[PDB]
Every structure is written in C-alpha cells, then in structure tokens.
Amino acid sequence: IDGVVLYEDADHKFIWLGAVQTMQYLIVDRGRGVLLDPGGVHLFSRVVTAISRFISVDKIDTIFFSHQDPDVSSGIALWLGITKAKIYISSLWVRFIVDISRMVPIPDKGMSISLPSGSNMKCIPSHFMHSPGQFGLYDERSRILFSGDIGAAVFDTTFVEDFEKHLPLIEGFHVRYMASNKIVSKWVEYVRRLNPLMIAPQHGAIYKDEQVNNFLNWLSGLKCGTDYIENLF
Amino acid sequence: GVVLYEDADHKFIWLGGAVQTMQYLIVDRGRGVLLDPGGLFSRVVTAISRFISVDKIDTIFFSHQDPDVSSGIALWLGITKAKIYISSLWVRFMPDISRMVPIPDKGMSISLPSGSNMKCIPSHFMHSPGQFGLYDERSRILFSGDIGAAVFDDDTTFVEDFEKHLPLIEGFHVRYMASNKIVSKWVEYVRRLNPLMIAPQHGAIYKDEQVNNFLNWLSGLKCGTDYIENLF
Ligand SMILES: [O-][O-]
Ligand SMILES: [O-][O-]
Ligand SMILES: [Cl-]
Ligand SMILES: [Fe+3]
Ligand SMILES: [Fe+3]
Numbered sequence: 001i002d003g004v005v006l007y008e009d010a011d012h013k014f015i016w017l018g019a020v021q022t023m024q025y026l027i028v029d030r031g032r033g034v035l036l037d038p039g040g041v042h043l044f045s046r047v048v049t050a051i052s053r054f055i056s057v058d059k060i061d062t063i064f065f066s067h068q069d070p071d072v073s074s075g076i077a078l079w080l081g082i083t084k085a086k087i088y089i090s091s092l093w094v095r096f097i098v099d100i101s102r103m104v105p106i107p108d109k110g111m112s113i114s115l116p117s118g119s120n121m122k123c124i125p126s127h128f129m130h131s132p133g134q135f136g137l138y139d140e141r142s143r144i145l146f147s148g149d150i151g152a153a154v155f156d157t158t159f160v161e162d163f164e165k166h167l168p169l170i171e172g173f174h175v176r177y178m179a180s181n182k183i184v185s186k187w188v189e190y191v192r193r194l195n196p197l198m199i200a201p202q203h204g205a206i207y208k209d210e211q212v213n214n215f216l217n218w219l220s221g222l223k224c225g226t227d228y229i230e231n232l233f
Numbered sequence: 234g235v236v237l238y239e240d241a242d243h244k245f246i247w248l249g250g251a252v253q254t255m256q257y258l259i260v261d262r263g264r265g266v267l268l269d270p271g272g273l274f275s276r277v278v279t280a281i282s283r284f285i286s287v288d289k290i291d292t293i294f295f296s297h298q299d300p301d302v303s304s305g306i307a308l309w310l311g312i313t314k315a316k317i318y319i320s321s322l323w324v325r326f327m328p329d330i331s332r333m334v335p336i337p338d339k340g341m342s343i344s345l346p347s348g349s350n351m352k353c354i355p356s357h358f359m360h361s362p363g364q365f366g367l368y369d370e371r372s373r374i375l376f377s378g379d380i381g382a383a384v385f386d387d388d389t390t391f392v393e394d395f396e397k398h399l400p401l402i403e404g405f406h407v408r409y410m411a412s413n414k415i416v417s418k419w420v421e422y423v424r425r426l427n428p429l430m431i432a433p434q435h436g437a438i439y440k441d442e443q444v445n446n447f448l449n450w451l452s453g454l455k456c457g458t459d460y461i462e463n464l465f
C-alpha cells in the first residue's frame with residue numbers, strides 16, 4: 001500500500017510503490033513523475049494514493065511498460081484518464097482513450113529518456129526473458145535497474161538478504177520462463193557493464209549490494225526454457 | 234463468418250488500427266467452445282448467437298496470456314459458466330480462479346459431448362513461454378494461436394498463394410518466434426498430427442497444400458535469438 005524511497009537526492013527520487021503479487025515503481029525528478037509497470041486494474045486508488053504522497057498524478061509525464069503482460073499493462077485505461085503521459089513500450093506491442101499518439105515505441109536495442117535533473121534513464125534490451133519485446137529501465141542517477149520479470153520471485157521484506165533462502169522463490173520461474181541460457185548469459189554480460197547497485201524486479205524483493213552480484217552470477221549459468229526442450233513436448 | 238467444417242454433430246466456425254484478430258467457435262452436439270475471444274464485445278456475442286446460445290458455451294480456450302487473447306476475460310466469465318483453459322504458467326497472472334483449468338506443459342485432451350476430442354498442442358516460446366494450440370480432431374483443424382499469424386492487412390480468407398502471403402508473415406515470425414530450435418521441433422510435432430487446416434489468431438487460414446507450405450517454410454526459419462546481435 002505505502003511508498004518506500006529507495007534512493008533520494010535533492011532533485012531525484014526512486015520509490016517503490018490467488019495471484020502473484022506485483023511491484024510498482026515511481027521515479028520523481030524535479031517534481032515530474034515516471035511510472036514503472038503500474039498494471040493491475042485493482043485498487044487503482046492504492047497506487048494513486050501512494051503516488052500522491054510524493055507528486056501530483058497530474059505530473060506523471062512518462063509510463064514505462066516492460067512488456068505486454070496483463071500484470072504489467074492491465075490498468076492502462078485508468079492511467080490514461082488522469083495523466084497526459086506517453087507510454088513507453090516495445091515497438092513489438094504498440095500495434096496491439098488508447099490513442100496512438102500516447103505510444104512511444106522502443107526499438108529493439110533500446111533508447112534513452114532525458115530527465116529534468118540532467119540525468120538519463122536507459123531502456124535495457126531484455127528480449128525473450130520471457131517476452132520477445134521486453135525492456136528494463138536503468139535509472140542512471142540512482143544506479144537502480146528495474147528489471148521487469150527478470151529476478152522475479154513468484155512465491156510469497158524490501159531487500160533480499162539471503163540468496164539461498166530466496167532461491168526457491170525464483171528458481172522454478174526462471175528455469176521455465178526464461179527462453180535459454182544463450183539469451184540469459186548475454187543479458188548478464190550487458191547488465192554487468194552497467195554497474196547497477198540494485199536490481200528491482202516486477203515481482204518480489206529487491207536485490208542490492210552483494211545480492212546483485214549473487215543474482216547475476218546465478219543467472220548467467222542457469223539452464224532454462226528451451227534448454228529443457230524435452231519437457232516442452 | 235465462415236463455416237470451416239460441418240457434419241451432423243460438429244461444426245468449426247470462423248466467427249468473421251490495431252492488427253485484427255481471428256475468433257473461432259466449435260459447436261458440438263449443441264454446446265460451444267470459444268477460441269481466443271479477446272480483442273466490440275457486442276459483435277462477438279451476436280456472431281456467436283447465429284450458431285449457439287451463449288448460455289451453451291461450456292469451454293473457452295486461451296492460447297496464451299496476451300491482451301489480444303485475454304482482454305475480455307471478465308465479460309466471458311460474467312456471461313457464461315464456461316471453464317477457461319490456459320497454460321498453468323498464466324493461471325496466477327490474469328488479474329475467479331476456480332474457473333481456470335491449467336494446461337500442463339505437454340498438453341492435455343479435452344473431451345467433447347459427441348465423443349470427439351480436442352488436444353492442446355504445446356507451442357511454447359512461439360512466442361509466449363506458455364502457449365498452446367487447439368487441435369480439433371474431428372475436423373483435423375489446428376487453431377494455432379500466434380503461429381502462422383499475419384500482421385499486415387493485405388487481402389483474403391484462405392491463403393491461396395503462399396509466396397504472396399509471405400511478406401505478411403515473415404517479419405512477424407523472424408522477430409517473435411524464439412529460435413529455429415523451437416520452431417522446427419514444433420513443425421515436426423505438428424507434422425505428426427496431420428492437420429488439414431492451420432487457423433491462426435491473426436490473418437488468413439492455411440488449408441491443404443498451404444499447410445504443407447507453411448510448415449516447410451517455418452521449419453527452416455532463422456528467428457529470434459538466432460539473430461541475437463539485433464537484440465542488444
Ligand atoms: O510473467 O510474470
Ligand atoms: O500477437 O503477439
Ligand atoms: Cl511472451
Ligand atoms: Fe511477464
Ligand atoms: Fe510479470
């Protein structure tokens with residue numbers, strides 16, 4: 001329900017807030033907002049209330065969709081009514097009120113979004129993990145990577161503090177939903193070159209400090225998806 | 234609307250801006266099976282009612298999780314008592330759960346009142362990690378979800394020239410299917426089913442020799458992570 005500030009300086013904040021639950025994020029920069037994967041038509045008023053402790057919903061200029069899934073995108077009609085924001089999503093999904101002038105299509109290799117503070121955000125290619133058109137968002141100023149489904153925990157604190165206790169919450173999901181070790185290890189190599197201090201997924205607790213390294217090391221060697229093709233037929 | 238198969242007890246029916254979507258209905262001894270009804274809800278209801286009372290839809294099949302498949306889920310659960318079959322990967326992600334039947338990864342059979350079966354066909358990573366087609370054994374029609382989809386609005390109901398249909402499907406399959414490894418396994422699996430039609434969720438239907446043409450083309454297609462330098 002309530003909002004938790006993960007990073008703060010004078011001009012810029014990164015804020016957290018039968019089904020798997022979902023994590024929603026807000027970036028505030030010189031008083032303007034960027035909303036990350038707000039999906040979930042249910043208590044739309046919970047997210048609005050939480051946002052309103054930091055910024056007028058008026059002032060959300062950008063809404064970022066990591067990919068096309070309903071847990072990401074379901075509430076899109078409600079946000080379009082109270083904001084004038086553009087919606088950033090992979091060009092794979094744009095061609096599917098919802099008026100086309102609200103869409104910013106992200107090309108396959110990503111793009112940057114400039115912020116009033118002088119900092120940038122970078123859309124991080126994350127394709128086929130699982131969706132063929134998926135991006136993360138790297139907030140350069142905080143060094144927080146919003147990673148979409150990557151790092152997600154699906155089975156029921158803010159930060160991970162024991163990777164071994166966390167592993168059972170993420171192992172089945174990554175083994176089955178990430179497409180292959182080939183895609184997963186290239187992503188790790190790409191993300192390592194960013195030097196994120198946190199990895200904040202769309203489900204479950206956030207990786208910070210040594211747990212970023214722990215997660216990245218585990219993922220880069222994971223066999224997943226079509227690596228077990230005999231399980232898929 | 235176009236009747237694709239019909240005998241005394243069993244029919245398979247195509248119910249007739251954004252890329253547009255194909256909705257299908259199976260009628261069997263007077264009961265209904267709706268395929269991917271997602272995507273003017275008042276059009277689909279009326280169209281269904283030309284063949285069957287919406288009362289009598291017992292089953293709704295979702296090939297995967299995307300909004301063009303699932304967006305109308307609340308309305309279909311509200312106006313029917315049908316169960317919804319979907320990959321177990323997605324049951325816990327469609328924001329009452331006892332109405333969802335999770336399909337296990339290797340598929341399952343769904344029995345029809347006439348005695349015929351429908352088979353859920355594993356179609357994972359093409360594109361969604363949890364995707365199934367529905368093979369209606371009596372008609373030998375495979376409803377294929379996104380596989381075979383055309384996204385460019387050219388012209389016709391059945392594919393009649395594979396080479397002319399190709400520009401409408403090539404880019405979609407090259408970019409959205411995960412790898413040649415997965416698609417050629419799928420082709421080999423579908424070859425052992427001997428479908429007389431492949432009916433996709435977008436674009437024209439492949440029948441007879443065009444089933445052959447599509448499968449031969451897809452089985453050699455380099456796609457998805459095969460072009461990984463384009464993805465970073
Ligand atoms: O897919 O979460
Ligand atoms: O249609 O993806
Ligand atoms: Cl997907
Ligand atoms: Fe997802
Ligand atoms: Fe998700």
Ligand SMILES: [Fe+3]
Nearest residue numbers: 297299360379
């Ligand atoms: Fe799809």
Ligand SMILES: [Fe+3]
Nearest residue numbers: 299301379434
């Ligand atoms: Fe589709």
Ligand SMILES: [O]
Nearest residue numbers: 069071072149
């Ligand atoms: O998702």
Ligand SMILES: [O]
Nearest residue numbers: 299301302379
């Ligand atoms: O889809």
